[PDB]
Design a binder for this molecule. Structure first.
Ligand code: 0V5
Ligand code: 0V5
Ligand code: NA
Ligand code: NA
Ligand code: NA
Ligand code: NA
Ligand code: NA
Ligand code: NA
Ligand code: NA
Ligand code: NA
Ligand code: NA
Lengths: 420, 420
């Protein structure tokens, strides 16, 4: 939907509640894990996102019978007839690579297009392939496809990630679940989407120790069954809507969430001067009509400050008091929103992966262009506080990760319209 | 032209000649300089490129009477009626900012949209603005527009670039040419497009000392007149077509060029094992049917190895003999071709701005996507040597900098077709 734009009038102090959807970043590996199920499997709390639809399409293309209605995906792998992920879908989304592990582990074969570039500057998939080789996979990468094979089951092995990789951890965890023997996975990602995947695998019959730690110990089983599972709440969507309160001086309650998924972010909101109240499954941020204090942060793997909140908190800092330091350590090209925020009057100075934001009293509306998922939400935040009417082009990126975004913001009083 | 593609069959040893067009990177500042001319001005050897057409459109939008036919741009500023460069064109290309200096210097007013992001990761335009302020400009950046004003003429001053900036040097050189007094420009870019601009300004009546050095000394004049000027040959187009010989083991003669514009590149071709012959205005590279030796390089300001040749030489190195240590120092996100070359079988390892290419004997055709101007030519080079039929999507980027690229390559024996 390359032509869609948002038209936003800034200046409304946002107030109300938002129901948080299932995590985009958990839905994708959980969908891939359905390939492992030997009886029908149902996922609920699934957000209606572009990436979800792409992976549902990919899985259907394997021959799996699959339905996606409302927030619910049902899949029956009895009809699966191939292990092929085509270029046309994989170029749409790197996360399509998450089918590699389960296809290989269950069927002994997988052919998946080699991912190309990621707009925000990603590492190649080398670590995913190395991990699978540690379990006995033979991997050829040629004519633009990864060809992975194994005779019989993968074999339990010793996997160690040289750098933290969320997707590599997911891929190998799925593969190890059906391997013959015990697999150790060291330097595993601790992101809670890993834990959510592990819990669903356990519900399906897997044997996994070390949840929420950097060392996962998997005892492979012969087969996994279907189950019903609800996707964990989206911690990034949660932080994003709380940031909408922070930037506008308002008060937003996010329901159907879990503050334990985003403690580092909540701490930063408190440092801004916000009053953060919470319960077991809800959070409220009240900025009390105050200008937030600018807060420094360094993106790092969970449980530290998440890269997927960086652009959004940078936007809040743009109108914050004082100045703040930002360091992106996870991605190589995740400051694409900076020149766009600068068009709206922000004072941001960058050198490589380090940025310094000097907060300004007011932003001014100007036409801007979204470059990636979280950048699009960063520009929405800026537009919500800016003086005047901002047009944001290429807003399609937002649909990869924020369902019903216009509706959710309108419910808080936002003057926002999608033209498409 | 977002959906144009190239379909290339690799494996032909390329042989023949290519007439080199005027430099894209000189045509843009020379076009902007036409704003200074108090009588009709004519540029010849102008390449028919998207960026040229954009700047011609922008200049026409100022009210300047302008015609672009064949390789010739004719302009008469007698009808100029505004000093405004709109968002819609500036978001098309950063180089639209080159009208800022001459508009301000001649008319005392310029309103130019603030450039947003550059795909390959560029610095902001802060240095351009600081330089203009050194000549007495008042600059307000608001509602996404740079508003520059001065009462009467700019005043000669001391300009110092803290980092080399080709566009900043161009903008300030044009502005200084009409200032009242003497301007010193230190740490000036030495790119030969600066020299070409300076020579045209001198032909128009300007007073400029220090050509081809890092210290330009400008004595402002009251007015500049029109002239007829021929754009310097394109050194990057030259290197690009010589690289097509190198990668295919062929023999290509580039005519209408100047080897003194690209000595660092020619030395690297010799290091590959190619026979480079040359005259005053032509070059021939004969690779003698041999596999090139992989060659290391570090991009640096002219006269060192140019960033605008990096992607192309990386493609040649992908099939070369040995390791090539490639270091990019000019742009922050100019390895976007790496994942695409990897899809074709290249062995390239990246860490930040450092890359290591391990040459492979053969590439295999696979669908790939161009991400920027020079990346698109890099993928064309890879497709020309790869085994099979490569489809390159988003080839429109190539039209920003390579005139008649299909025809020029077809003249060398290439099996290349544009579908559009
Ligand atoms: C990268 C991997 O891009 P993609 O999802 O493939 O568009 C990312 O944004 O993380
Ligand atoms: C940057 C500046 O992008 P643009 O020309 O504005 O598309 C570049 O490629 O140098
Ligand atoms: Na993700
Ligand atoms: Na191979
Ligand atoms: Na970068
Ligand atoms: Na800035
Ligand atoms: Na340029
Ligand atoms: Na642009
Ligand atoms: Na301002
Ligand atoms: Na004359
Ligand atoms: Na690689």
């Amino acid at each position: 939907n390359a032509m869609d734009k948002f038209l936003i009038t800034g200046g409304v102090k946002l107030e109300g509640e938002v129901r948080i959807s299932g995590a985009k970043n958990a839905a994708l590996p959980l969908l891939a894990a359905m390939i492992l199920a030997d009886s029908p499997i149902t996922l609920t709390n699934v957000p209606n996102l572009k990436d979800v639809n792409t992976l549902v399409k990919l899985i259907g293309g394997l021959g799996v019978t699959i339905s996606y209605e409302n927030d619910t995906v049902k899949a029956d792998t009895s009809t699966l007839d191939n292990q092929f992920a085509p270029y046309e879908l994989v170029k749409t989304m790197r996360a399509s690579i998450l089918v590699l592990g389960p296809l290989l582990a269950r069927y002994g074969n997988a052919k998946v297009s080699l991912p190309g570039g990621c707009a925000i500057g990603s590492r190649p998939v080398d670590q995913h392939l190395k991990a699978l080789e540690a379990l006995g996979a033979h991997i050829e990468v040629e004519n633009g496809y990864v060809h992975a094979t194994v005779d019989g089951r993968l074999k339990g092995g010793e996997v160690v990630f040289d750098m933290v990789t969320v997707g590599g951890t997911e891929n190998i965890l799925m593969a190890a679940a059906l391997a013959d023997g015990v697999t150790t996975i060291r330097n595993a990602a601790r992101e809670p989407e890993i834990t959510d995947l592990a819990q669903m695998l356990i519900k399906m019959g897997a044997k996994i120790e070390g949840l929420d730690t950097d060392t996962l110990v998997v005892t492979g089983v012969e087969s996994l069954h279907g189950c019903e599972y609800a996707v964990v709440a989206d911690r990034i969507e949660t932080g994003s809507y709380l940031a909408a309160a922070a930037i506008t001086g308002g008060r937003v309650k996010t329901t159907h969430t879990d503050p334990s998924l985003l403690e580092a972010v909540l701490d930063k909101f408190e440092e801004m001067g916000a009053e953060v109240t919470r319960g077991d499954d809800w959070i409220e941020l009240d900025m009390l009509g105050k200008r937030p204090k600018a807060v420094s942060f360094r993106t790092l793997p969970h449980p530290e400050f998440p890269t997927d909140m960086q652009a959004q908190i940078m936007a809040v800092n743009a109108i914050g008091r004082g100045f703040a330091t930002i360091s992106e350590t996870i991605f190589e090209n995740r400051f694409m929103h900076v020149p766009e925020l600068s068009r709206m009057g922000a004072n941001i100075q960058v050198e490589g992966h380090d940025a310094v934001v000097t907060g300004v009293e007011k932003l001014q509306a100007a036409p801007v262009m979204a470059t990636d998922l979280r950048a699009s939400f960063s520009l929405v935040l800026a537009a919500l506080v800016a003086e005047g009417d901002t047009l944001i082009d290429r807003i399609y990126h937002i649909d990869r990760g924020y369902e019903h975004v216009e509706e959710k913001l309108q419910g808080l009083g936002a003057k926002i319209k999608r033209v498409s």
